[PDB]
Amino acid sequence: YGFQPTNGVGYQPYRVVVLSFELLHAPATVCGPKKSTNLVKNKCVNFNFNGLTGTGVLTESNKKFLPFQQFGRDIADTTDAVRDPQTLEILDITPCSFGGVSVITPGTNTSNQVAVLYQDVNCTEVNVFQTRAGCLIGAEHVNNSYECDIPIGAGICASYQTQS
Amino acid sequence: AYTNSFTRGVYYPDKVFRSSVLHSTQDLFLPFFSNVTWFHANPVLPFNDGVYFASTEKSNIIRGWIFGTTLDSKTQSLLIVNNATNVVIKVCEFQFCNDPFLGVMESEFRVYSSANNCTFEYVSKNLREFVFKNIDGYFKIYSKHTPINLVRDLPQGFSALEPLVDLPIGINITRFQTLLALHRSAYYVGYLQPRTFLLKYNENGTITDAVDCALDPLS
Amino acid sequence: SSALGKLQDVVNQNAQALNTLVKQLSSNFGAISSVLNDILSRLDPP
Amino acid sequence: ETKCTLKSFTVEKGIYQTSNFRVQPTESIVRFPNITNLCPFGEVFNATR
Amino acid sequence: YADSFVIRGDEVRQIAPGQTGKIADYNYKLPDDFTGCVIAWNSNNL
Numbered sequence: 001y002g003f004q005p006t007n008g009v010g011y012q013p014y015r016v017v018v019l020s021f022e023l024l025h026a027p028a029t030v031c032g033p034k035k036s037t038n039l040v041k042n043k044c045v046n047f048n049f050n051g052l053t054g055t056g057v058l059t060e061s062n063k064k065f066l067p068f069q070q071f072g073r074d075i076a077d078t079t080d081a082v083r084d085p086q087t088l089e090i091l092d093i094t095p096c097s098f099g100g101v102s103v104i105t106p107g108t109n110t111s112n113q114v115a116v117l118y119q120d121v122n123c124t125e126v127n128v129f130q131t132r133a134g135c136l137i138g139a140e141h142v143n144n145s146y147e148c149d150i151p152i153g154a155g156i157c158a159s160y161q162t163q164s
Numbered sequence: 165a166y167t168n169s170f171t172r173g174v175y176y177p178d179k180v181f182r183s184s185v186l187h188s189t190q191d192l193f194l195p196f197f198s199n200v201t202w203f204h205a206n207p208v209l210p211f212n213d214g215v216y217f218a219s220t221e222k223s224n225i226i227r228g229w230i231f232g233t234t235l236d237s238k239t240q241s242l243l244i245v246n247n248a249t250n251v252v253i254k255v256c257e258f259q260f261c262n263d264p265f266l267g268v269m270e271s272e273f274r275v276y277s278s279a280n281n282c283t284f285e286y287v288s289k290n291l292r293e294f295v296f297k298n299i300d301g302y303f304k305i306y307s308k309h310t311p312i313n314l315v316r317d318l319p320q321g322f323s324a325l326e327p328l329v330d331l332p333i334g335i336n337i338t339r340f341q342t343l344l345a346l347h348r349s350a351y352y353v354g355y356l357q358p359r360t361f362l363l364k365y366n367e368n369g370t371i372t373d374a375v376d377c378a379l380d381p382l383s
Numbered sequence: 384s385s386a387l388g389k390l391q392d393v394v395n396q397n398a399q400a401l402n403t404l405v406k407q408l409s410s411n412f413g414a415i416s417s418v419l420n421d422i423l424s425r426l427d428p429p
Numbered sequence: 430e431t432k433c434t435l436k437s438f439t440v441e442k443g444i445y446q447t448s449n450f451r452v453q454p455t456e457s458i459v460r461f462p463n464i465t466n467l468c469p470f471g472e473v474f475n476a477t478r
Numbered sequence: 479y480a481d482s483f484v485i486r487g488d489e490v491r492q493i494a495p496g497q498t499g500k501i502a503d504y505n506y507k508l509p510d511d512f513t514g515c516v517i518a519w520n521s522n523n524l
């Protein structure tokens with residue numbers, strides 16, 4: 001080619017690069033970059049650390065891994081800790097609160113009022129009274145002791161007095 | 165010569181931390197109380213399924229290994245070397261001396277005579293154990309450096325080996341060798357089989373004891 | 384102070400059963416994995 | 430809800446399990462190792478000759 | 479419901495209950511809960 005600067009387009013030099021991706025039969029190789037995002041703590045989230053996928057609330061911990069160890073698990077083999085791959089800090093994993101809901105009825109033939117128990121849940125995550133059976137909403141906590149009427153649990157009972 | 169390991173060649177088989185528990189695994193291990201070859205100072209050995217490899221000295225006579233199927237050209241092989249500088253992993257097609265070594269002036273490296281088609285490079289008394297294995301195109305290397313209070317005999321005790329490297333090569337392996345620094349101015353080889361072990365984990369997460377579950381009725 | 388085996392056994396039996404229940408959440412029963420986020424990631428809905 | 434789970438327009442005094450409850454994930458996060466092997470294409474796409 | 483059209487001769491297996499394909503993913507879909515028949519016959523003579 002005798003290239004010259006006063007050549008019409010289609011006679012001027014073009015530089016070409018041909019990328020050819022091949023896949024023999026190895027174990028792996030080059031791939032595209034994996035974008036990430038900041039880490040928030042003390043909220044039920046959907047996390048993903050390197051491929052470790054789950055959901056729950058992440059707090060900071062008092063464990064000490066070994067430099068090559070990347071996550072922890074307990075008896076029954078559930079993941080209960082993790083290392084995040086940028087801070088090099090280990091974080092506790094706690095499942096996000098759950099439970100049952102029970103309604104306390106004084107009998108529909110007597111009233112339409114009800115109380116509600118959220119079983120083994122702290123009261124913040126739902127007048128309002130904290131038992132050892134859970135959080136109880138819609139019942140007043142009196143100071144006298146009667147015979148048990150409706151069993152709530154852990155020593156507490158409920159009843160329709162006087163009207164409430 | 166041949167010698168008897170006692171409880172040797174235990175490595176962490178995964179990245180998982182564990183507090184004070186007893187965890188059971190199935191993997192490739194060096195059985196307890198095994199028949200390990202003894203070498204003094206060497207020849208082409210087999211691989212066939214992983215390798216345990218200890219060594220003892222204060223100087224550094226053991227200067228890496230060489231791996232592969234043919235240890236020559238016409239097929240690819242690995243080469244792991246250490247001059248007085250630092251480690252040099254390398255993967256080409258080579259032409260290896262049938263008796264390859266390096267001298268100690270301090271001029272050396274009569275190891276190979278060819279370095280073609282390189283597909284991977286890298287550059288940068290005592291008891292030094294290593295476990296080499298090769299699964300799904302990955303060549304894993306575990307290692308541990310314990311100090312003996314002897315010079316060159318295989319001691320007794322428990323010491324778990326921590327993972328070092330991971331190489332996505334793809335290379336086939338059937339044979340391996342060793343490399344030594346000559347004189348110009350002791351090592352063992354076990355093999356690994358599929359066993360089932362019971363590892364005792366400390367509260368910091370280290371393996372402190374183990375049980376080989378196919379030794380005897382008590383185990 | 385220096386025998387309560389009948390009380391210890393009912394505790395042990397219940398714990399041994401509850402652990403076997405959770406340890407079954409990691410068997411395939413003839414599937415590609417034990418995780419639903421792995422069958423919902425490398426398979427189409429059909 | 431009690432009347433639904435009991436299948437009846439009358440209910441008698443007691444305590445009744447009616448449903449479950451659980452907190453939902455607020456958002457999603459992702460973590461990964463930093464970059465280092467960006468792999469320079471400013472040699473093949475940026476050559477002098 | 480009679481749905482009547484014409485396609486390329488290749489993606490006749492693209493009209494099926496539950497599948498992936500450039501014809502099935504963009505121009506015509508059937509539910510996996512399909513119930514009915516599919517008839518196809520050649521046409522370049524019309």
Ligand SMILES: *[C@@H]1O[C@H](CO)[C@@H](O[C@@H]2O[C@H](CO)[C@@H](O)[C@H](O)[C@H]2NC(C)=O)[C@H](O)[C@H]1NC(C)=O
Nearest residue numbers: 083084085086087088089461462463464465466
């Ligand atoms: C990942 O990269 C970031 C920077 O991109 C590193 O963040 C620094 O961390 C050190 C702590 O060792 C801090 O003193 C610096 O202020 C941080 N700088 C920035 C810009 O965030 C982080 O250490 C790297 N981690 C790894 C494992 O490579």
Ligand SMILES: *[C@@H]1O[C@H](CO)[C@@H](O[C@@H]2O[C@H](CO)[C@@H](O)[C@H](O)[C@H]2NC(C)=O)[C@H](O)[C@H]1NC(C)=O
Nearest residue numbers: 015017467468469470471472473474475476477
């Ligand atoms: C080759 O190198 C040059 C210079 O480093 C790159 O040119 C830059 O391109 C960006 C986006 O078009 C501009 O914002 C910059 O101003 C350019 N550089 C300069 C110095 O002005 C170019 O992107 C590189 N080529 C490739 C393919 O990466």
Ligand SMILES: *[C@@H]1O[C@H](CO)[C@@H](O)[C@H](O)[C@H]1NC(C)=O
Nearest residue numbers: 107108109110111439441442
């Ligand atoms: C339920 O209601 C009926 C109808 O009002 C009444 O006859 C009966 O006594 C009530 N049952 C009680 C109060 O236990």
Ligand SMILES: *[C@@H]1O[C@H](CO)[C@@H](O)[C@H](O)[C@H]1NC(C)=O
Nearest residue numbers: 121122123124125130131132
């Ligand atoms: C419930 O949450 C409060 C708020 O942090 C906390 O102080 C308390 O210990 C928790 N448990 C009980 C039983 O109140």
Ligand SMILES: *[C@@H]1O[C@H](CO)[C@@H](O)[C@H](O)[C@H]1NC(C)=O
Nearest residue numbers: 127129140141142143144145
């Ligand atoms: C119940 O009695 C205790 C006495 O220790 C008192 O502190 C509390 O305020 C009382 N509660 C009510 C609702 O009277």
Ligand SMILES: *[C@@H]1O[C@H](CO)[C@@H](O)[C@H](O)[C@H]1NC(C)=O
Nearest residue numbers: 166167168197198199200201
């Ligand atoms: C190891 O095997 C060889 C094979 O002949 C045998 O001669 C030797 O006694 C064995 N060593 C031990 C410690 O069992």
Ligand SMILES: *[C@@H]1O[C@H](CO)[C@@H](O)[C@H](O)[C@H]1NC(C)=O
Nearest residue numbers: 245246247248249250252287
């Ligand atoms: C050590 O050996 C490697 C093997 O190629 C070589 O690259 C390196 O230069 C050697 N060290 C010195 C100081 O030459």
Ligand SMILES: *[C@@H]1O[C@H](CO)[C@@H](O)[C@H](O)[C@H]1NC(C)=O
Nearest residue numbers: 237238256257279280281282
């Ligand atoms: C490997 O080297 C030989 C000789 O140098 C050469 O013929 C062959 O093309 C090389 N392999 C590849 C994939 O280029």
Ligand SMILES: *[C@@H]1O[C@H](CO)[C@@H](O)[C@H](O)[C@H]1NC(C)=O
Nearest residue numbers: 025026233301334335336337
């Ligand atoms: C390793 O050698 C075997 C010989 O049986 C061969 O079948 C296999 O393909 C080789 N490995 C690779 C990755 O090609």
Ligand SMILES: *[C@@H]1O[C@H](CO)[C@@H](O)[C@H](O)[C@H]1NC(C)=O
Nearest residue numbers: 064365366367368369370372
């Ligand atoms: C490691 O374990 C030892 C004994 O089990 C313990 O005393 C120590 O606190 C742990 N943590 C260290 C050394 O950081």
